[PDB]
Each structure stands twice: as structure tokens, then as C-alpha cells.
Amino acid sequence: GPPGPPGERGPPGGVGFPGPPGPPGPPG
Amino acid sequence: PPGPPGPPGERGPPGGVGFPGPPGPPGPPG
Amino acid sequence: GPPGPPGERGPPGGVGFPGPPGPPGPPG
Numbered sequence: 001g002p003p004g005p006p007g008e009r010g011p012p013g014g015v016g017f018p019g020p021p022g023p024p025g026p027p028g
Numbered sequence: 029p030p031g032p033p034g035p036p037g038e039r040g041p042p043g044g045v046g047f048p049g050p051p052g053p054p055g056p057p058g
Numbered sequence: 059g060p061p062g063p064p065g066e067r068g069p070p071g072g073v074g075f076p077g078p079p080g081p082p083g084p085p086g
Binding site for chain 1: 045
């Protein structure tokens with residue numbers, strides 16, 4: 001018998017790195 | 029017959045860098 | 059037959075966590 005077909009696609013990666021700081025607040 | 033399907037593929041790469049955070053608070057009265 | 063080869067690489071993961079809040083705004 002011939003080799004079977006390829007397996008299913010792998011699972012998604014894990015989540016990425018955390019983002020950078022947000023914008024400064026407005027003036028007081 | 030043909031053999032069974034192979035094992036699942038490799039896990040994908042990690043996602044992208046996260047978005048910038050929300051804004052800071054207002055500055056002080058000085 | 060013998061098992062098939064591994065499947066294709068998974069998709070990329072989700073975006074990382076948001077960054078922290080920005081710093082305070084300028085002094086009044």
C-alpha cells in the first residue's frame with residue numbers, strides 16, 4: 001500500500017509579544 | 029489500501045507585537 | 059500503507075497583549 005496523505009495543518013502559534021506604551025495624557 | 033494520514037503539521041509562529049496601550053492621565057495642575 | 063508525512067505549518071498566532079498606559083500628560 002502507498003504512503004498515506006499528509007496530516008492536517010498545524011495549530012496556530014501562541015500570542016505575540018506585548019505592545020509598547022500608549023500616548024501621553026493631555027496637559028493639566 | 030493507502031496508509032493513514034500523517035501527523036499534524038508544526039505549530040505556527042507566534043503572532044505579532046501587541047498594540048500600543050491606552051493614554052496616560054492628564055498632567056498635574058503643575 | 060505506512061503513515062503519511064506531517065501536515066503543513068500552522069498559521070501565525072494572535073497579536074500580543076496591549077501595551078501599558080501612557081505616561082501623564084504635561085504639567086499645567
